[PDB]
């Protein structure tokens, strides 16, 4: 489907860099980190990138925090 994913469960003191580092293997077109909510709104190059990102990064740990990567709720 789309190329927008939304990440939940990020650390309290997460930085934009950390998100970009996280998905260092993809082409970020958009990236908005909500520090008060620990949720990021990334936009990838295409459908496939959003898929691989979800698959690599849903349920992984970022500094001891379990991440939930999924297609931006449409």
């Amino acid at each position: 489907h789309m190329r927008k994913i939304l990440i939940r469960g990020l650390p309290g003191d997460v930085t934009n860099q950390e998100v970009h580092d996280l998905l260092s293997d993809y082409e970020l077109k958009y990236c908005f980190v909500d520090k008060y909510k620990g949720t990021a709104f990334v936009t990838l190059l295409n459908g496939e990138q959003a898929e691989a990102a979800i698959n690599a990064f849903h349920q992984s740990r970022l500094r001891e925090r379990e991440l939930s990567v999924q297609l931006q709720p449409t």
């Binding site: 469960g9 650390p11 309290g12 003191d13 008060y36 620990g38 500094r63 001891e64």
Partner: protein, 174 residues
């Protein structure tokens, strides 16, 4: 810039109260303010984690550790400021308020551990679990209060400096 109002109201309240005191200032050249802002952001994550149910165990633990890291730096810097202060009145109040920080932050790691293991449990009593959570909130309230009291007496003690050569934090209002 935290916003109005599935968390823990009183932790978020405490998180926000610290946030507002530190957003009063620019972070540039003031690590006390940078750290304070961080703690507040990790406190907010905590009220969220405090509902978590599970998967929150590991996080809840890490988070509390993170926080203690941030306080250790508020303390460390608060001390360098106090070491530069030439006002016994102030140098005193500063040391007083920043001594408890480490302690409170340690109670916080301990309380969060009990809370973490309690998460998931079905056998644990009703009274036991809401009490675990209320000691957390209590400790969090006081940790935040302490950090914000520092920052204000750190700012006061930035006024009379022994040498402009020694340490200095930048106090510039936003």
């Amino acid at each position: 810039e935290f916003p109005e109002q599935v968390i823990n109201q009183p932790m978020m309240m405490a998180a926000r109260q610290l946030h507002d005191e530190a957003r009063k200032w620019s972070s540039k050249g003031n690590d006390i303010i940078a750290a304070a802002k961080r703690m507040a952001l990790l406190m907010a994550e905590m009220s969220r984690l405090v509902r978590g149910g599970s998967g929150t165990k590991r996080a809840l633990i890490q988070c509390a550790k993170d926080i203690a890291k941030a306080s250790d730096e508020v303390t460390r810097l608060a001390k360098e400021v106090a070491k530069q202060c030439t006002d016994k009145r102030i140098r005193t109040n500063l040391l007083q308020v920043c001594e408890r920080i480490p302690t409170i932050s340690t109670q916080l790691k301990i309380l969060s551990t009990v809370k973490a293991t309690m998460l998931g449990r079905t056998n644990i009593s009703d009274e036991e679990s809401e009490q675990a959570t209320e000691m957390l909130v209590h400790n969090a309230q006081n940790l935040m209060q302490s950090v914000k009291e520092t920052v204000r007496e750190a700012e006061a003690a930035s006024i009379k400096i022994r040498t402009d050569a020694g340490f200095t934090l930048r106090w510039v209002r936003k």
